[PDB]
Amino acid sequence: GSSGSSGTGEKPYECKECGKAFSQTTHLIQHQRVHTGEKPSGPSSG
Numbered sequence: 001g002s003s004g005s006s007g008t009g010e011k012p013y014e015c016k017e018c019g020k021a022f023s024q025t026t027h028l029i030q031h032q033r034v035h036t037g038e039k040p041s042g043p044s045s046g
């Protein structure tokens, strides 16, 4: 009941920031780039 952690189908690689599954570990790491490279109004730090 509510166990999850089951890769019945979806790839074991999914972005935990937006929600995107990729069929390549390298793809997931690359996508993150979009998350770590934006101009957030009022850039204080980061």
Ligand SMILES: [Zn+2]
Pocket: 015, 016, 017, 018, 019, 020, 031, 032, 035
């Ligand atoms: Zn993402």
